[PDB]
């Protein structure tokens, strides 16, 4: 019916903590596997935090909010989904203040928000710039994701794809450096070939197939148009104004039936159909064409002058229409080649996340020391800053710092080493030695500096990770009454 | 709550643990199969009140009928049953030899596995003893068929096979089947049981039976024609009744005169239908179902011999001999699909007229045994003796080698194999010796079914064989547990019957021993 | 701390469940290892029975209750497709690897440390194969020992000597010019009405349907085989007309008119017969796949022509390579170009059915392995063995190197791994010890199935050492040590290579399973 | 572990008898036959007393346990621990243990 009081906040903690305890060991290169029992006996031993919670059906509303936020994190950022849930769960697992001490949530939220502003201030001090102009330096960063993948055979090609494709979409003239992989870097699979034939196309691609030979095979100046008896006459006139301009290809938004394709085939042009509105806007920017209301209102200006060429070359038992150019019309297209669909699927998702890494690094050329170094470094600042924190908020303020130790805690647990012994010595290193280094080795299990090991992560990934974990913990703590109602 | 079942991970099937002896359980399923047929072994075999799937009562002692009606669901028993079905190929006897012998091999194998001997070593001993038995069995061949085609010879050797299926009446059946078998042996290299057919007729008793040539059918000739030599025989499955048109053929009748007009039009049409039979040069017609009254006179009009075969197996019997196939229409003048026969006539035997298809012009290699009996269940049980009796001499067309019966070979073959195991060092002697004791189960079956202490029969059979008196078997008698010579009494078994029985029985037993776990599946 | 309709084993019980499943699957398949091993039955539920020791059939066709065990079942499907053997021993090593890992995990050792020991021992184990592999040139005697080593593990030791010479010669018939061996060049045919030991090779193809007419030649020593795909039976009107009739008699006229579509073409077969060497001491054969009327079969038989009907597409492609005649899709364009050439073409007669044989071909680049058996399940049993025996000789020729058997490599690699210290950390020494004792399950199981003591047999072969490269294995008949090279017991290099790479990957991944969560089960 | 594999117990026990003799012979080589001095017995007494106290009465009872033995052996005489009396008294802290050269009477 209705649940209120401390029962609500104590329940949301157990829910978010339970979801975090599942994926504690799926962090780092030693990500432990999880066996999901399907109702039909099917089993998948995946170790991805997203796919695990995606398939696990939950009933608690608080656990759903913790999952949906990680999903939204996965789209905006291609990394850090597992760390958001572990930190958000660990930040909430400190229930000593909520129940035993009877601290109001508004007091803790004042402490969590104060720590978030200080946690962000501590990361930017330990940051390090990047020489993004160097292709080998940025290549050393993208190799962290290429490891243990099928694209490791030609990783140099895999980085050059994502690195240039993002830079082509990178619009630095407007200042904010807006990047949109899904909008301006459309990716499509091409049957046949191999991973080595994967290249970038400087324009828009149309996956429609050629049904009849009466079409333009090669044109230097693509004129791209953009827009039974009674059916014949109404179609005979709408097609007349199109052919009057002598086009090279007609890309209409809505469908082109058989009789409409008949008159278009008399003009010997490629028949394209079933395209969306935004796609037409991208087609127009590819060649400078004009979208018109109806075929009746077509004018001589409706041309794709300036484009490179039109081509309907058959590649691997499939025709492909290209309106590409030898310039940069605010977009690109990744033509992923592969001898089979099994290899094509892996390279698609692999290079997609690789573009997200370069997207975050290029939005701000500032990295941070991973392997628990950033967490233990930030925790040292709050523990020192809390000494001057006059008030009762000092106790939960310090607890947030110790909650960040979970990241090196899980990395040490998966390696099999002593968690207390290394974490104790790890915290001492950040006190005396520099905080920008002395993290954790995820492969060896012992301590190591991050200057000697290139585990440097982006800054925007950690900022949105801590900001989302704190805002998620602040969210569920503000929930004090779960009620029904339609 | 743990600890649950051990070694159970495949569909929850009953997996017997190491203490429960999974191999011991598949053997018990085969031992129970032997007890169902161990009592029916021999001339004094006990009958089984079998209840058919049609809720029909039948009292018989035939092994093939018991297993065909007993739904054997255990796979370990199906293998031995498959050997019985394979026993029916290449020989028509020795079925219970496979059940009794294999049951003794598996029953005795448990005594070895319980000691600790590996199942793979038990199999090597039985395979060695089976190979050794095939070397000793030619040496036990006492007599051989002279192949004189003499009824006195064929009937004498046939008495052993007829007994244990229909005891007491082995004199009549041996003479009749001898008269039927001798008439085809001149057809050298073509003898088969398919030629010697059987036709049961309700009658006084078994003594009133006889043999007649050609494909005999109990149903007398319905028509008035006594004899006809016409080759073209038109067989129709559809009976003589009111015609129906395959097209619409809507027949509307309102008044009483119109009923009589259409009735006359049908008789005029049927008169034309039977007219078409004679137009195609065929004075013979067969019918499956009923025969009309007006069409009956039409058969006598053109002197067309009317024939009635209500049984489906009787119809298919003619389709493969004369060639006349049954068509779905009623009297279609299809002269191409008709049959060919040299002579067709009616004959009265035992106060009953029966249709005959005799081959007068042709050489003729087909016969039929017309059995008489006051009970259908009795004639059917006698028919099973004809198959096991005729098939005994289908084997004698091959190498003619007879061995003594009555458990005589089983003791000598056991005595010769036991000596081979005593002098053979190693572990194979344990399974070789038990292979000899498996043969002793067959005399033990004959003695138990005759009401005699079986251990006294084995003690006497071994003593006379110790003195070299081979060819000595169990004297079938209730008040005399002694033994007698099987040669002097005329009891003889077939060589190939024992050869293929010892071979298939060992493979069935070895195939069961090689299995250690029954597992379910799904496609 | 849990939600409704959800369950998860957070502690190490997830490993105890997966480790228990592998031990259970180990105890099942260990009884069918080698020739002395026992057989397993496969009841389909509907009543069918199938006996087989091949682990892939006991994992692909059979159904398993445990969800974790079904993962290892899919691995055998992968192991079979790459090498064709080693699916049973792959499951034993996984169970024994996980068994030894559970012994150390109970002592507080992390699973990830054990997997690092397997990766180090695996890389050392692969190098040991390169040192002991014998690159003996492929000959008849060498392949006989290899095919015998494979076929004895699927039969009753009676069809081994029979099937060995057939399987060896089947590959040699197609192996020449250093070409990659293709198994599509050998077709497998089954036949009832005969015993099991009657299996033999056929130099050419075998077809199901043959000539059915009295006036046919029982054997054709030579002929110009004509390949065709045109039906010589009653067909529809192929011209600008149709079927219109007023009665049953007028309908019969359309049959006479429609039959003229074939009658002009049936004589066309007689024309090319008389044309291309129609004189004496010659013959002619038709292998038209589609149906043929008895009239055309009756007509051409008078001219002395063997005509066949109702064949398969695959047989027609093989027939063209054997003969040389290209398929004619229309009799109107007949010519000698559509003809081939072959030797003895006879008809094999069984008790009821009869089969066509095209033996003595010129250059077919293909043969057929005629299987004969009395029972249906025995045919499927022998077929699975020959397919495994063919891949065994294929791997021996495709990869010219072979290695010993009888667990001699496992006994040797176990001693090699013990004499090898880590280079990444010290605790990996435990994982190497688990890998060493895991490989010994094969020589242990072979002693169990043969009826010998597990410990006495292993200690003898493991204690046997000398001051030279010496092999040693388990003697299944005597139980004493045995040098596999001195007896003709050889395995493949790719089998043992893929075995170490397969067992290490799956035993690793099963150990990395930290929790088992139900996805709404 | 080996008995579950079908090994008899009597075989394992015969290995223990062999391992015992080998282990017993190796013990003869590792033993140090040095002379027993106060510096050595303190290491023995500390090693024995640490396993029964809170690492605070070590130096307290060590010097008492060692000196109690040296007072009752000289000239290679046979030793007897019954020569040392063990008394107990209250009203003092645990660290007040000390020696008594003479004897205590009730």
Curated annotation (Swiss-Prot), chain A:
What GO cellular component term, any one, is given? microtubule
GO biological process per UniProt: binding of sperm to zona pellucida; chaperone mediated protein folding independent of cofactor; chaperone-mediated protein folding; positive regulation of protein localization to Cajal body; positive regulation of telomerase RNA localization to Cajal body; positive regulation of telomere maintenance via telomerase; protein folding; protein stabilization
Organism for this UniProt entry = Homo sapiens (Human)
Disease per record:
Neurodevelopmental disorder with speech or visual impairment and brain hypomyelination: An autosomal dominant disorder characterized by global developmental delay, impaired intellectual development, poor or absent speech, and brain abnormalities including hypomyelination, cerebellar atrophy, and optic nerve atrophy. Some patients have severe visual impairment, dystonic movements, and seizures.
- State the name under which the record lists this protein: T-complex protein 1 subunit gamma
Location in or out of the cell: Cytoplasm
Q: Which residues carry this modification: Phosphoserine?
A: 156
* Chief location: cytoplasm
UniProtKB/Swiss-Prot annotation, chain B:
**Phosphoserine modified-residue sites:** 17, 156, 207, 263, 311
Give me the reactions it catalyses.
ATP + H2O = ADP + phosphate + H(+)
Q: Tell me which family the UniProt entry assigns to this protein.
A: Belongs to the TCP-1 chaperonin family.
User: What is known about its subunit structure?
Assistant: Component of the chaperonin-containing T-complex (TRiC), a hexadecamer composed of two identical back-to-back stacked rings enclosing a protein folding chamber. Each ring is made up of eight different subunits: TCP1/CCT1, CCT2, CCT3, CCT4, CCT5, CCT6A/CCT6, CCT7, CCT8. Interacts with PACRG. Interacts with DNAAF4. Interacts with synaptic plasticity regulator PANTS.
Q: What is this protein called?
A: T-complex protein 1 subunit theta
| Residues the record lists as Phosphotyrosine modifications | 24, 499
Q: What is its main location?
A: cytoplasm
Crosslink site: Glycyl lysine isopeptide (Lys-Gly) (interchain with G-Cter in SUMO2):
218, 248, 254
Q: Which residues of the sequence carry a binding annotation for ADP? A: 41-42, 94-97, 163-165, 406, 493
One GO MF annotation is: ATP-dependent protein folding chaperone
Its biological function?
Answer: Component of the chaperonin-containing T-complex (TRiC), a molecular chaperone complex that assists the folding of actin, tubulin and other proteins upon ATP hydrolysis. The TRiC complex mediates the folding of WRAP53/TCAB1, thereby regulating telomere maintenance. As part of the TRiC complex may play a role in the assembly of BBSome, a complex involved in ciliogenesis regulating transports vesicles to the cilia.
Q: Name one Pfam family in it.
A: Cpn60_TCP1
* Places the protein is found: Cytoplasm; Cytoplasm, Cytoskeleton, Microtubule organizing center, Centrosome; Cytoplasm, Cytoskeleton, Cilium basal body
List residues modified as N6-acetyllysine.
312, 394, 460
SUPFAM superfamilies tied to this protein: GroEL apical domain-like, GroEL equatorial domain-like, GroEL-intermediate domain like
Say where the cross-link Glycyl lysine isopeptide (Lys-Gly) (interchain with G-Cter in SUMO1) occurs. 453
CC annotations in GO: azurophil granule lumen; cell body; centrosome; chaperonin-containing T-complex; cilium; cytoplasm; cytosol; extracellular exosome
Question: Record keywords: Methyltransferase included?
Answer: no
Residues at which ATP binds: 94-96, 164-165, 406, 493, 498
Q: Which PROSITE patterns match?
A: TCP1_1, TCP1_2, TCP1_3
- Alphabetically list the UniProt keywords: Acetylation, ATP-binding, Cell projection, Chaperone, Cilium, Cytoplasm, Cytoskeleton, Hydrolase, Isopeptide bond, Nucleotide-binding, Phosphoprotein, Ubl conjugation
E.C. designation(s): 3.6.1.-
Source organism per entry reads Homo sapiens
For the ligand (Mg(2+)), the binding residues are: 93
Record has Isomerase as a keyword: no
UniProtKB/Swiss-Prot annotation, chain C:
Q: Cross-referenced PANTHER family, in alphabetical order?
A: CHAPERONIN
- Look at the named UniProt entry and state the broad enzyme category this protein falls under: hydrolase
Write out the residues that bind ADP.
34, 86-89, 153-154, 406, 491
Q: What is its main location?
A: cytoplasm
Its annotated function is as follows: Component of the chaperonin-containing T-complex (TRiC), a molecular chaperone complex that assists the folding of actin, tubulin and other proteins upon ATP hydrolysis. The TRiC complex mediates the folding of WRAP53/TCAB1, thereby regulating telomere maintenance.
Q: Glycyl lysine isopeptide (Lys-Gly) (interchain with G-Cter in SUMO2) crosslink: positions?
A: 246
Q: What is its EC number?
A: 3.6.1.-
Enumerate the Gene Ontology biological process terms.
chaperone mediated protein folding independent of cofactor; chaperone-mediated protein folding; positive regulation of establishment of protein localization to telomere; positive regulation of protein localization to Cajal body; positive regulation of telomerase RNA localization to Cajal body; positive regulation of telomere maintenance via telomerase; protein folding; protein stabilization
Q: Give the residues the record marks as binding ATP.
A: 34, 86-88, 406-407, 491, 496
Q: PROSITE patterns annotated for this entry? A: TCP1_1, TCP1_2, TCP1_3
Residues where Mg(2+) binds: 85
Q: Which reaction does it catalyse?
A: ATP + H2O = ADP + phosphate + H(+)
Q: Which residues form the signal peptide?
A: none
Query: Would I find Nucleotidyltransferase among this entry's keywords?
Result: no
The record's family statement is: Belongs to the TCP-1 chaperonin family.
Annotated Gene Ontology cellular component terms: chaperonin-containing T-complex; cytoplasm; cytosol; extracellular exosome; microtubule
Could you cite one Gene Ontology molecular function of this protein?
A: ATP-dependent protein folding chaperone
Kindly identify the disorder that the protein's record connects it with: De novo genetic variants in nearly every subunit of the TRiC complex, including CCT6A, have been found in individuals with a broad spectrum of brain malformations, and clinical phenotypes ranging from mild to severe epilepsy, developmental delay, intellectual disability, ataxia, and other features of cerebral malfunction.
Task: Quote the protein name from its UniProt record.
Answer: T-complex protein 1 subunit zeta
């Amino acid at each position: 019916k209705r649940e209120s009081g401390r029962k609500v906040q104590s329940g949301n903690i157990n829910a978010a903590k339970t979801i975090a305890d599942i994926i504690r060991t799926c962090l780092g290169p030693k990500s432990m596997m999880k066996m999901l029992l399907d109702p039909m006996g099917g089993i998948v031993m995946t170790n991805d935090g997203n796919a695990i919670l995606r398939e696990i059906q939950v009933q608690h509303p608080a656990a759903k909010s913790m999952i949906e936020i990680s999903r939204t994190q996965d789209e905006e950022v291609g990394d850090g989904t597992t760390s958001v849930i572990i930190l958000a769960g660990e930040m909430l697992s400190v229930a000593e203040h909520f129940l035993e001490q009877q601290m109001h949530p508004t007091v803790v939220i004042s402490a969590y928000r104060k720590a978030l502003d200080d946690m962000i201030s501590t990361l930017k001090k330990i940051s390090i710039p990047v020489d993004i102009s160097d292709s080998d330096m940025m290549l050393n960063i993208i190799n962290s994701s290429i490891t243990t993948k099928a694209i490791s055979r030609w990783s140099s090609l895999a980085c050059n794809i994502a690195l240039d494709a993002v830079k082509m979409v990178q619009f630095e003239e407007n200042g904010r450096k807006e990047i949109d992989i899904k909008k301006y870097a459309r990716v499509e699979k091409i049957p046949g070939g191999i991973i080595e034939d994967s290249c970038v196309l400087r324009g828009v691609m149309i996956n429609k197939d050629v049904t009849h030979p009466r079409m333009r095979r090669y044109i230097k100046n693509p004129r791209i148009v953009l827009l039974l008896q009674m059916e014949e006459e109404y179609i005979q006139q709408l097609c007349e104004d199109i052919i009057q301009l002598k086009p090279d290809v007609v890309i209409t938004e809505k469908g082109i039936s058989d009789l409409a394709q008949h008159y278009l085939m008399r003009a010997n042009i490629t028949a394209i159909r079933r395209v969306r509105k935004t796609d037409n806007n991208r087609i127009a920017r590819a060649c400078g064409a004009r979208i018109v209301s109806r075929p009746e209102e077509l004018r001589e200006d409706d041309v794709g002058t300036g484009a490179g060429l039109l081509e309907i070359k058959k590649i691997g038992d499939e025709y492909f229409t290209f309106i590409t150019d030898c310039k940069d019309p605010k977009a690109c297209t990744i033509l992923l080649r592969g001898a089979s669909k099994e290899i094509l699927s892996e390279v698609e998702r692999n290079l997609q996340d690789a573009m997200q890494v370069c997207r975050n690094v290029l939005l701000d050329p500032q990295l941070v020391p991973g392997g628990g170094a950033s967490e233990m470094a930030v925790a040292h600042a709050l523990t020192e800053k809390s000494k001057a924190m006059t008030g009762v908020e000092q106790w939960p303020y310090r607890a947030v710092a110790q909650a960040l130790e979970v990241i090196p805690r899980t990395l040490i647990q998966n390696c099999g080493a002593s968690t207390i012994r290394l974490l104790t010595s790890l915290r001492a290193k950040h006190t005396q030695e520099n905080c920008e280094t002395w993290g954790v080795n995820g492969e060896t299990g012992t301590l190591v500096d991050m200057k000697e090991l290139g585990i440097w992560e982006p800054l925007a990934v950690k900022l949105q990770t801590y900001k989302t974990a704190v805002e998620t913990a602040v969210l569920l703590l503000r929930i004090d009454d779960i009620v029904s109602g339609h | 709550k743990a600890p649950g079942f051990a070694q159970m991970l495949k569909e929850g099937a009953k997996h017997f643990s190491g203490l429960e002896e999974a191999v011991y359980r598949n053997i018990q399923a085969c031992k129970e199969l032997a007890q169902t047929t161990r009592t029916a072994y021999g001339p004094n075999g006990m009958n089984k009140m079998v209840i058919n799937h049609l809720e029909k009562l039948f009292v018989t002692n035939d092994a093939a009928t018991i297993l065909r009606e007993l739904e054997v669901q255990h796979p370990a028993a199906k293998m031995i049953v498959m050997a019985s079905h394979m026993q029916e190929q290449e020989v028509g006897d020795g079925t219970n030899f496979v059940l009794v012998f294999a049951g003794a091999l598996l029953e005795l194998a448990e005594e070895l596995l319980r000691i600790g001997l590996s199942v793979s070593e038990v199999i090597e001993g039985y395979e060695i003893a089976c190979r050794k038995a095939h070397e000793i069995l030619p040496n036990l061949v006492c007599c051989s068929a002279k192949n004189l085609r003499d009824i006195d010879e064929v009937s004498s050797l046939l008495r052993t096979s007829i007994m244990s299926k229909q005891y007491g009446n082995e004199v009549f059946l041996a003479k009749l089947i001898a008269q039927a078998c001798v008439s085809i042996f001149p057809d050298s290299g073509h003898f088969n049981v398919d030629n010697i057919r059987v036709c049961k007729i309700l009658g006084s008793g078994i003594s009133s039976s006889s043999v007649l040539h050609g494909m005999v059918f109990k149903k007398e000739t319905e028509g008035d024609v006594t004899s006809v030599k016409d080759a073209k025989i038109a067989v129709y499955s559809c009976p003589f009744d009111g015609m129906i048109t395959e097209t619409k053929g809507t027949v509307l009748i309102k008044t009483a005169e119109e009923l009589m007009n259409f009735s006359k039009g049908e008789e005029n049409l049927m008169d034309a239908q039977v007219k078409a039979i004679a137009d195609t040069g065929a004075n013979v017609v067969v019918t499956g179902g009923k025969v009309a009254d007006m069409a009956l006179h039409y058969a006598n009009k053109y002197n067309i011999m009317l024939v009635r075969l209500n049984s489906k197996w009787d119809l298919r019997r003619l389709c493969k001999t004369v060639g006349a196939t049954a068509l779905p229409r009623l009297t279609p003048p299809v002269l191409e699909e008709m049959g060919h026969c040299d002579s067709v006539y009616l004959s009265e035997v035992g106060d009953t007229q029966v249709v005959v298809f005799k081959h007068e012009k042709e050489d003729g290699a087909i016969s039929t045994i017309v059995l008489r009996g006051s009970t259908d269940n009795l004639m059917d049980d006698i028919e099973r003796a004809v198959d096991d009796g005729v098939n005994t001499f289908k084997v004698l067309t091959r190498d003619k080698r007879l061995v003594p019966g009555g458990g005589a070979t089983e003791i000598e073959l056991a005595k010769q194999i036991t000596s081979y195991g005593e002098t053979c060092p190693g572990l194979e002697q344990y399974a070789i010796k038990k292979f000899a004791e498996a043969f002793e189960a067959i005399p033990r079956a004959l003695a138990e079914n005759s009401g005699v202490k079986a251990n006294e029969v084995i003690s006497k059979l071994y003593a006379v064989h110790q003195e070299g008196n081979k060819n000595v078997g169990l004297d079938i008698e209730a008040e005399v547990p002694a033994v007698k010579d099987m040669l002097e009494a005329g009891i003889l078994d077939t060589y190939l019957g024992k050869y293929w029985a010892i071979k298939l029985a060992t493979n069935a037993a070895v195939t069961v021993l090689r299995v250690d776990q029954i597992i379910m599946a799904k496609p | 701390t849990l939600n409704p309709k959800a369950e998860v084993a957070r502690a190490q019980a997830a490993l105890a469940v997966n480790i228990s499943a592998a031990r259970g699957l180990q105890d099942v398949l260990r009884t069918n290892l080698g020739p002395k091993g026992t057989m397993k039955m496969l009841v389909s539920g509907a009543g069918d029975i199938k006996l087989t020791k091949d682990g892939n059939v006991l994992l692909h066709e059979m159904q398993i209750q445990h969800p974790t065990a079904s993962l290892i079942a899919k691995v055998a499907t992968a192991q079979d497709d790459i090498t064709g053997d080693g699916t049973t021993s792959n499951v034993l090593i996984i169970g024994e690897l996980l068994k030894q890992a559970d012994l150390y995990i109970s002592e507080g050792l992390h699973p990830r440390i054990i997997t690092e020991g397997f990766e180090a021992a695996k890389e050392k184990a692969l190098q040991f194969l390169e040192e002991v592999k014998v690159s003996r040139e492929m000959d008849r005697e060498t392949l006989i020992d290899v095919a015998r080593t494979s076929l004895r593990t699927k039969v009753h030791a009676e069809l081994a000597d029979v099937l060995t010479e057939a399987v060896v010669d089947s590959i040699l018939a197609i192996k020449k010019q250093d070409e990659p061996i293709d198994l599509f060049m050998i077709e497998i045919m089954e036949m009832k009405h005969k015993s099991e030991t009657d299996t033999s090779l056929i130099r050419g193809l075998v077809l199901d349907h043959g000539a059915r007419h009295p006036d046919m030649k029982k054997r054709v020593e030579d002929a110009y085989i004509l390949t065709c795909n045109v039906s010589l039976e009653y067909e529809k009107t192929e011209v600008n007309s149709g079927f219109f009739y007023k009665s049953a008699e007028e309908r019969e006229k359309l049959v006479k008119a429609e039959r003229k579509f074939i009658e002009d073409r049936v004589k066309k077969i007689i024309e090319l017969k008389r044309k291309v060497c129609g004189d004496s001491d010659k013959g002619f054969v038709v292998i038209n796949q589609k149906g043929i009327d008895p009239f055309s079969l009756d007509a051409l038989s008078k001219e002395g022509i063997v005509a066949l009907r109702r064949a398969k597409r695959r047989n027609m492609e093989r027939l063209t390579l054997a003969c040389g005649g290209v398929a004619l899709n229309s009799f109107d364009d007949l010519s000698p170009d559509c003809l081939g050439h072959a030797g003895l073409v006879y008809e094999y007669t069984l008790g009821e059915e009869k089969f066509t044989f095209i033996e003595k071909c010129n250059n077919p680049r293909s043969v057929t392995l005629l299987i004969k058996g009395p029972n249906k399940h025995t045919l499927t049993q022998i077929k699975d063995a020959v397919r495994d025996g063919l891949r065994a000789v294929k791997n021996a020729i495709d990869d010219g190197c072979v290695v010993p058997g009888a667990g001699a490599v496992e006994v040797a690699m176990a001693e090699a791994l013990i004499k090898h210290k880590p280079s990444v950390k010290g605790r990996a020494q435990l994982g190497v010890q688990a890998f060493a004792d895991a490989l010994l399950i094969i020589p242990k199981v072979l002693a169990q199935n043969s009826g010998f003591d597990l410990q006495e047999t292993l200690v003898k072969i493991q204690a046997e050492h000398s001051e030279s490269g010496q092999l040693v294995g388990v003697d299944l008949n005597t139980g004493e040590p045995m040098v596999a090279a001195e007896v003709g017991v050889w395995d493949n290099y790719c089998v043992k290579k893929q075995l170490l790479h397969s067992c290490t990957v799956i035993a690793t991944n099963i150990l990395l399973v930290d929790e088992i969560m139900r996805a709404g089960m």
